[PDB]
Subunit: 314 residues, 3 copies
């Protein structure tokens, strides 16, 4: 086995909409823990993190809810490190993507040599000074990059943060909605990425080959997969805050995750931005939840060609 | 010409739902025979097979309606051999997929060296002892494989059966819902298959190249194409009994069939699992029927780049 | 810069439906000129062409509204040449595709060495004698080809026409509804084309590589992109007169245009067949208009990986 350590992170202060807080709930109600155990997985639920209320949390310049988001990630980082110290793959059922700051930070405490694969329609690499929205769920990567140390002002709630990954330790997959400042950072730091243009050009097969070769070429290491459900096309994951057309297909999403699993190096996983209250219909909500579940199950073994135990079936 | 021998097989006792019996009807009402003749095809309709009612047909262990399904295939095998002896490509408009037992058996009587391409979300290779559902439409392949001789118990209605194909004579395309026992059989017999994972990785172009090279590499031979409409994605063929998301696209389905046609070796064809009463709307029914028709027309020449007679059009 | 010269062509007499005349309007109302200026583009609107009414325009044999379509293109050709003489890329917001006769003709007056990329589900290469519908929007290519000189009868309204392109100067992308006579012409003149079969086989990446290499292999030259919105799948562009299933995806359409832009050789562009009154719902209309806009923006720079000015963002 690989073992799994489930972490519910019902948090939404990284952006405007509060429904993202139900992510852990509807995902759990979909039978995630059960379907995982139905597989060759040993699951341990660490519960839903209790994020205290920070009443006094006025914006920092344009940055909104800094202390709340800062504390939420600091809290999450501690939990993730713990489960990692327990020899399990951390699975964060999230609210908004700002939690990746804590998820990747906690993970790196135990595996500083980790590599990150970021599935998303966005790069979430805006800094507290380049952001136009001020929503922290669009800035997690800037806080984690060591090269961006010096460009990140002292934002309340984030003094505990220590950039743990370098520009060369991350690969983007699915980009199609990147701001100008974010694009400048991409090219300036020489960050490796496969926007939808590259997926269209090479095919998901070549994309994954290159992504894994890029991160595991020099040597094998722990992999942290940060999956934003809007990385996929909205026809598959509509109940999300920032949908963008022309996304990855259900198939490509399952292909990305099946290949990650096969490396046997998955160490940390984030399933983020699932907002049940944003589904235009109860059918769109189930579609989003069911797709999110399928993606997660694939990260832990579930193969489309089929699976079977080391037993003589005939 | 190639000539075509149409065989209506309004049968449903291979599974629970009875609406699959209307397959031949709605397909014919869609204008199949007419659209085929509109092409460079010489069509001969052998009518709809009259499957007698077997009132006394209690389950065999967990296997349901064994005698009914057994007689239906025995009946179909005879018809298929006849049309094959008449020098025509047999086209079975089916009910459920259990009829493939009779379709491939009858075909092999006249062309024992045939090769099979099985388009489906499922492998339908469960044996009477490995099945959990007991529905025979999920077991046709086990009855036909010579390697599985000895694992198939004596089921009522199937004493006439003689496995005609070896593990090496078949290729699967589109798999994404395979049971554990079925997966064990796949790997144990070294069966050639392209699950959706392989389609995603290689592209339908490479998949077909390899499939045809695999079956016609050593030498040219008759090809039997067994097409289960659920092999395609449900957004294209919703009116079907066992839909699974992440299927082949309308394009890939047309690509598979266009390439098969171009081999000039198509010998037998099955269009199965079309259930009009399962369409959530009359629009989903037409969508399923129209897609099923398009796939069939492509099997006999209809090319997307266009077609034209050996005449000077200018 | 590249500069852009916008030309509204509210014309519909190339086919039955009149709603195509609103193309320029709804496209403009979508914010096209604004979104373009928001980019690195210098836009100049040349207004909407005033196509006089031709009351006396009885069919020529089977050809309908010949004088009206003939005058509309003659009018458009003059405008296009002008904007080209002004050093700008001509962008024709069209009605029906018959306007391509004038668009490509006017363009060639200033750049006789141009190469054409025709995105469409159809070849629109029927001649006035091979057409079965008589709608001129399905015949534009025959009027422009020099090889077809002698096969084009003297149709009223077209005496000003002079074929400007040879069979070797054009590439088709997206074909899936080609008539027999049209297919004969394709093969007879050895026209280069990528029907949906080739897109499926090679992938859009290889298709574009080959298309551009084919047209710019011997030397660099101006490119005229004639984009029929039905080239894309109807799930993306439903509000169109002749929809055909199995079309290019939103992604492939954006890939085609992003690659064209990157050549830095785009010289002329047509956005045709957008008919707002054909949307089954107001949502299908926005879907068509929004997709049409996205395709156009990509033709002028908008990249999915992101864009940014030559400024230090940090
Ligand atoms: N770049 C926009 C969108 C960010 C979207 C964030 B995400 O990926 O977490 O949903 C912003 O900075 O606000
Ligand atoms: N493996 C399941 C599903 C079989 C589905 C059958 B089919 O492909 O014919 O629709 C069963 O054995 O019952
Ligand atoms: N080939 C048919 C259809 C032409 C469709 C024209 B189009 O591409 O401009 O919409 C006809 O000649 O009428
Ligand atoms: Mn996102
Ligand atoms: Mn994100
Ligand atoms: Mn099936
Ligand atoms: Mn089947
Ligand atoms: Mn067209
Ligand atoms: Mn056209």
């Amino acid at each position: 086995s690989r073992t799994i350590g489930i972490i519910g992170a019902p948090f939404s202060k990284g952006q405007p909409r509060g429904g993202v807080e139900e992510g852990p709930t509807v995902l759990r109600k979909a039978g995630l823990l059960e379907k995982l155990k139905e597989q060759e997985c040993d699951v341990k639920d660490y519960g839903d993190l209790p994020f205290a209320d920070i009443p006094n949390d006025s914006p920092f310049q344009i940055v909104k809810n800094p202390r709340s988001v800062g504390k939420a990630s600091e809290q999450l980082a501690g939990k993730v490190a713990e489960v990692k110290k327990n020899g399990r793959i951390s699975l964060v059922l999230g609210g908004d993507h700002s939690l990746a700051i804590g998820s990747i930070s906690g993970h790196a405490r135990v595996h500083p040599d980790l590599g990150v694969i970021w599935v998303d329609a966005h790069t979430d690499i805006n800094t507290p000074l380049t952001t136009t929205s001020g929503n922290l769920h669009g800035q997690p990567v800037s806080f984690l990059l060591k090269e961006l140390k010096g460009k990140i002002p002292d934002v309340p709630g984030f003094s505990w943060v220590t950039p743990c990954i370098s520009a060369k330790d991350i690969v983007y997959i699915g980009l199609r909605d990147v701001d100008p400042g974010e694009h400048y950072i991409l090219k300036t730091l020489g960050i490796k990425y496969f926007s939808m243009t590259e997926v269209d050009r090479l095919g998901i097969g070549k994309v994954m080959e290159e992504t894994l070769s890029y991160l595991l070429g020099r040597k094998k290491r722990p992999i942290h997969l940060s999956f934003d459900v809007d990385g996929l096309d909205p026809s598959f994951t509509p109940a999300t805050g920032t949908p963008v057309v022309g996304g990855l297909t259900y198939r490509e999403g399952l292909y990305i995750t099946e290949e990650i699993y096969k490396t046997g190096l998955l160490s940390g996983l984030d399933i983020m931005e699932v907002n049940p209250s944003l589904g235009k219909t109860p059918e769109e909500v189930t579609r989003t939840v069911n797709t999110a579940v399928a993606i997660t199950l694939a990260c832990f073994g579930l193969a489309r060609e089929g699976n079977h135990k080391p037993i003589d079936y005939l």
